[PDB]
Amino acid sequence: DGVNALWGRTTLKREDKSPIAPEELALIHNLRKMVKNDWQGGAIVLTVSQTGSLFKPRNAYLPQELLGKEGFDALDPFIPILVSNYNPKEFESCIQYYLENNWLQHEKAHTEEGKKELLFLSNRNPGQLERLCAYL
Amino acid sequence: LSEYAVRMSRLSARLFGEVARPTDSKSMKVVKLFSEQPLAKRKETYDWYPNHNTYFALMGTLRFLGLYRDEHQDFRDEQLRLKKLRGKGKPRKGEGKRA
Amino acid sequence: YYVDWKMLRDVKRRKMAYEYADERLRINSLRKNTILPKDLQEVADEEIASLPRDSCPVRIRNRCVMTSRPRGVKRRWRLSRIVFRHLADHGQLSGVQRAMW
Amino acid sequence: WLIKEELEEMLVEKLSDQDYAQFIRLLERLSALPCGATEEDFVNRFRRSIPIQSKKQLIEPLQYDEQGMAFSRGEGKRKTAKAEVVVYGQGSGRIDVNGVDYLLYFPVTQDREQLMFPLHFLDRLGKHDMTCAVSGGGRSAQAGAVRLAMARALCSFVTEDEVEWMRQAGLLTADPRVRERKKPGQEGARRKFTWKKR
Amino acid sequence: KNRAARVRVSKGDKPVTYEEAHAPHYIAHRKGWLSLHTGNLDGEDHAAERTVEDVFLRKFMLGTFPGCLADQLVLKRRANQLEICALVLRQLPPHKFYFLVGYSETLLSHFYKCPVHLHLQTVPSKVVYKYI
Amino acid sequence: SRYGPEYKDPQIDKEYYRKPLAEQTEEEKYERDFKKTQLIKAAPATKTSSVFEDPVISKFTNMMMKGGNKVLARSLMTQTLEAVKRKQFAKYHAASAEEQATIERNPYTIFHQALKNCEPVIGLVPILKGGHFYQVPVPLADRRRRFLAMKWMIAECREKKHRRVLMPEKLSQELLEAFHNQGPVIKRKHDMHKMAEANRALAHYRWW
RNA sequence: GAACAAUAGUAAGCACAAUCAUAGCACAUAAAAACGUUAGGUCAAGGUGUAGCUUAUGGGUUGGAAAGAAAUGGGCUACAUUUUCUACAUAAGAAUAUCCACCACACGAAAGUUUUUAUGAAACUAAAAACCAAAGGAGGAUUUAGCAGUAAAUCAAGAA
Numbered sequence A: 001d002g003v004n005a006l007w008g009r010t011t012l013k014r015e016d017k018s019p020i021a022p023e024e025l026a027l028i029h030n031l032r033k034m035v036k037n038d039w040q041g042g043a044i045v046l047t048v049s050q051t052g053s054l055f056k057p058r059n060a061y062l063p064q065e066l067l068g069k070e071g072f073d074a075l076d077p078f079i080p081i082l083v084s085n086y087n088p089k090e091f092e093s094c095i096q097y098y099l100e101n102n103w104l105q106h107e108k109a110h111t112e113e114g115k116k117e118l119l120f121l122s123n124r125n126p127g128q129l130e131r132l133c134a135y136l
Numbered sequence B: 001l002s003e004y005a006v007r008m009s010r011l012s013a014r015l016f017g018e019v020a021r022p023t024d025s026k027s028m029k030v031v032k033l034f035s036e037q038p039l040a041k042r043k044e045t046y047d048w049y050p051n052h053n054t055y056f057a058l059m060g061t062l063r064f065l066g067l068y069r070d071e072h073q074d075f076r077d078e079q080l081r082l083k084k085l086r087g088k089g090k091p092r093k094g095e096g097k098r099a
Numbered sequence C: 001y002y003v004d005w006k007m008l009r010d011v012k013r014r015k016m017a018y019e020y021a022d023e024r025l026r027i028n029s030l031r032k033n034t035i036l037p038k039d040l041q042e043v044a045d046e047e048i049a050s051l052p053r054d055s056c057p058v059r060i061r062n063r064c065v066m067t068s069r070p071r072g073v074k075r076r077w078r079l080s081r082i083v084f085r086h087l088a089d090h091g092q093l094s095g096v097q098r099a100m101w
Numbered sequence D: 001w002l003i004k005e006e007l008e009e010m011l012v013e014k015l016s017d018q019d020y021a022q023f024i025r026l027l028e029r030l031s032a033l034p035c036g037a038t039e040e041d042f043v044n045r046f047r048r049s050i051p052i053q054s055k056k057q058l059i060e061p062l063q064y065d066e067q068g069m070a071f072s073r074g075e076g077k078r079k080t081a082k083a084e085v086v087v088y089g090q091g092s093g094r095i096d097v098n099g100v101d102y103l104l105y106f107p108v109t110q111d112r113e114q115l116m117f118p119l120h121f122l123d124r125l126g127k128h129d130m131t132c133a134v135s136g137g138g139r140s141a142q143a144g145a146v147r148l149a150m151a152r153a154l155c156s157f158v159t160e161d162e163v164e165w166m167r168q169a170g171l172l173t174a175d176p177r178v179r180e181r182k183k184p185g186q187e188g189a190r191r192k193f194t195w196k197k198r
Numbered sequence E: 001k002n003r004a005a006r007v008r009v010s011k012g013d014k015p016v017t018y019e020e021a022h023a024p025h026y027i028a029h030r031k032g033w034l035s036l037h038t039g040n041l042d043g044e045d046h047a048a049e050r051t052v053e054d055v056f057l058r059k060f061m062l063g064t065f066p067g068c069l070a071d072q073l074v075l076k077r078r079a080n081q082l083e084i085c086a087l088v089l090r091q092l093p094p095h096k097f098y099f100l101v102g103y104s105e106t107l108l109s110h111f112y113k114c115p116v117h118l119h120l121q122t123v124p125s126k127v128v129y130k131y132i
Numbered sequence F: 001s002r003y004g005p006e007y008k009d010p011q012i013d014k015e016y017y018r019k020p021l022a023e024q025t026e027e028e029k030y031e032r033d034f035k036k037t038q039l040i041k042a043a044p045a046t047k048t049s050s051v052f053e054d055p056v057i058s059k060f061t062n063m064m065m066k067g068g069n070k071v072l073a074r075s076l077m078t079q080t081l082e083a084v085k086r087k088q089f090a091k092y093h094a095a096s097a098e099e100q101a102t103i104e105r106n107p108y109t110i111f112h113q114a115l116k117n118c119e120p121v122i123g124l125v126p127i128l129k130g131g132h133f134y135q136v137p138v139p140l141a142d143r144r145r146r147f148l149a150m151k152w153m154i155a156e157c158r159e160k161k162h163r164r165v166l167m168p169e170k171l172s173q174e175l176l177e178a179f180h181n182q183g184p185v186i187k188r189k190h191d192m193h194k195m196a197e198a199n200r201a202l203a204h205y206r207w208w
Numbered sequence G: 001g002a003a004c005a006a007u008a009g010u011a012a013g014c015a016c017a018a019u020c021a022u023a024g025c026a027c028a029u030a031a032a033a034a035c036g037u038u039a040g041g042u043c044a045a046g047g048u049g050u051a052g053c054u055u056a057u058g059g060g061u062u063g064g065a066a067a068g069a070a071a072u073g074g075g076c077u078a079c080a081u082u083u084u085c086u087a088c089a090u091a092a093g094a095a096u097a098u099c100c101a102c103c104a105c106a107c108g109a110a111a112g113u114u115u116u117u118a119u120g121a122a123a124c125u126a127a128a129a130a131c132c133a134a135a136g137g138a139g140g141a142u143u144u145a146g147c148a149g150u151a152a153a154u155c156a157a158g159a160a
């Protein structure tokens, strides 16, 4: 998780306070050999993220800019599965799940009007929905 | 930064007229010294002061020729005359305190 | 007559700087470059300091052309702050008005 | 009734407040009695008509363009931030500000609450598709500007009675609060330097 | 109390012209600028040379026409030519007025190296706007 | 104030407009609101028609704000409600049959009830008479009592907390303490009552 | 020197008012604020009355005005946890005055030492880095400012 960190620059410095390349680290260097497709009888599931990324903008989420020139170069071919937000069917299921555990404790949270506000504020996004439901 | 980029950077500099060979940060000031006009030669500097000598002398001669009448200079002369009448004028050279 | 002896000194100072402006520039070029040998730069420092004292751009002082106030002078009009108000309040300067916003 | 200044210009003579009040009260006594034809002409010379007073807004008619149905345009401005909002009445619930999704563009929960406020008041959160273009100001200035633009742009799709409800809630009125200047001789707009009495 | 270019109230016996009857904060509100030129624009140079030349004319015209000058000059600069508009009382004979007009036009033109226009309007006395 | 005297405070509650036909006097009130053509101020940025807001939360959120960080103040108020919710949820799980349907898991109910127990009933104001100051009790108004309770909450959790313990968790503890009438804030409320009762014979000094 | 169900006052001038500016109005803010008071401040912006100097109280050249026992005013940075560091706009990771068998550590030098850069004939002036980590743990009597986009926090440019 966070495969983009195997090629991007590293914050860690040395005694001279000069940045070190990501290949200097032994853990990354050996783990790098674990993603180059040469062995048999195995499958690897990867995920390029942004929360823990270094020197990457907030808006960027597509695989190429997160990996960069070098990261994308040493990863082809792959299957870029896209993770989306909630669909209307999923959104109702998640809200009903919390109501079964009595999580949404607001008096008017049980009505459809509260559901509409949750849909608009969270943009039917699982990450934002959890933060909202934690205090309403 | 590759050898290809070095040639292109130098080749572009040759045509547009900049410095081709590498130059230090401090060594570029000599180019700046001749590229710009020195401070002491700008028209704002050496022509900063209007020539008061010509302005004063011209109106001095026109005053004596009756073409320009200056009230302020007349005021000094009129008061200067009264000081002479009252007995308090400017002594000549070598008359201040040696006597 | 300039309005004060100080103003007269500045005119002499500006005149002397103009005469030695090009000669100073040529010698000062040698000092400000690190590619020439250090031996030549030391000789240049002796020559540039042998020039007359008044022929220095830093010694030039910006005064008012009317009252010769050493400070409080706007560079655009070359006038003291008191004289500038005296001309501007009477409407004798184009485009200058009391600020209101 | 005639203003004292207007009355002085009708009699071509200066008057006083006590004299004007006495004259007006006398007309009220004359006007409270049964009225004759001659008196009404005399009284009407002292009558003045006020202009039309109304606070209803001008409803912008819906515009159709290139097979596009029920799209209106709105203009909003608040605290050095202008917002241009066009709302389509035939789409789902989504807002595209400056070519990006509104959730990404407004991370702050409060800012996304401002955009909800017009739509939630009309119970049409998911019945409109919008695209916006706002420039200048901070996060809150833009959020307020987009809120104002939607309120004016949504008046076309809403009945007239609820438009009055919109005004009573403060959606349609521009915010006049703008940053003041810094006076010469003071630390800020109102704060002055420390005043040592002795 | 502000005192810049103001005439103080003294009963009702002192005449005041239009220019002197307005405080300096009324500039560009009730009265215009006595001089107009390009030097004080946004991106224009040569503003100090115009100012010193303007002041000299305020002192030359006032001294060339002693007593007969009504009020302040008006200086207009178009292209490279300089136009001076003045109000002069009926004091000198017309022979002397044309002498001074001819003298002023030639002397200033050869001094500032620019053509000079001198237009005169004659009034019987100083124009009074308030008091009196 | 850029708003003139004619401008009035807007009405935000949506329910006030959607059901006006069930009353007559209130109908006359808002029909004349626009018939008089009275101008309406712009909607404030803080207040909104969202059903999940609460006026007592906004006032408490504003006081926690230092400088101009409304985001930080709102973030702290969000965590504190979450922190209270987590603690009550954990206590509900580890309880007997009779104890289960006693614990309250609604932070808003806890927050509203906590402040109504920290409000003093009678305050003190110094009065100068005879060259000396006498602490004279007075019947503090409801707005002052409500404001005074909030200030005591903020003052306590800002001063005598440890440097390691975070603000959201420290405030959460005091809310539960005040909910059970045992917090130091409740002790401070009683202390103000102790002084007021001691000077019960000086109430004659006040002239209102 | 006024009594409006009016009893000696009248019409003009200046000021307030109104108007103008801050590109709609409104509000608000600017701007304005007479006659006088304090022999208020300014002969050193400049001019000038009176008094004084005139091989000198004038003019020019060269070098030099150090230094803080101590007291005080107005400010910037702090004394941290609503904080510090890094990435980045605001959903993250890490540090956190204490423990100790040894160690070593938080916040906070803007100061000081050294090196270098910028301007300049001259660096004593300014800025950057390395090293260094001191007072400071919310301040006695007393006291200043602010009524809403104001206080407060934060960022930027310009004048010379």
Ligand SMILES: [K+]
Residues within 6 Å of the ligand: G043
């Ligand atoms: K004198």
Ligand SMILES: [Mg+2]
Residues within 6 Å of the ligand: C003, C004
């Ligand atoms: Mg002098």
Ligand SMILES: [Mg+2]
Residues within 6 Å of the ligand: none
């Ligand atoms: Mg050097």
Ligand SMILES: [Mg+2]
Residues within 6 Å of the ligand: C058, C059, C060, C061
């Ligand atoms: Mg200098």
Ligand SMILES: [Mg+2]
Residues within 6 Å of the ligand: D188, D191
């Ligand atoms: Mg401030």
Ligand SMILES: [Mg+2]
Residues within 6 Å of the ligand: G017
């Ligand atoms: Mg009046």
Ligand SMILES: [Mg+2]
Residues within 6 Å of the ligand: none
């Ligand atoms: Mg206006």
Ligand SMILES: [Mg+2]
Residues within 6 Å of the ligand: none
């Ligand atoms: Mg006003």
Ligand SMILES: [Mg+2]
Residues within 6 Å of the ligand: none
């Ligand atoms: Mg003012």
Ligand SMILES: [Mg+2]
Residues within 6 Å of the ligand: G032
């Ligand atoms: Mg006014």
Ligand SMILES: [Mg+2]
Residues within 6 Å of the ligand: G039
């Ligand atoms: Mg005195």
Ligand SMILES: [Mg+2]
Residues within 6 Å of the ligand: G040
């Ligand atoms: Mg005093």
Ligand SMILES: [Mg+2]
Residues within 6 Å of the ligand: none
């Ligand atoms: Mg004095």
Ligand SMILES: [Mg+2]
Residues within 6 Å of the ligand: none
């Ligand atoms: Mg003098």
Ligand SMILES: [Mg+2]
Residues within 6 Å of the ligand: none
């Ligand atoms: Mg003196």
Ligand SMILES: [Mg+2]
Residues within 6 Å of the ligand: G048
């Ligand atoms: Mg004298």
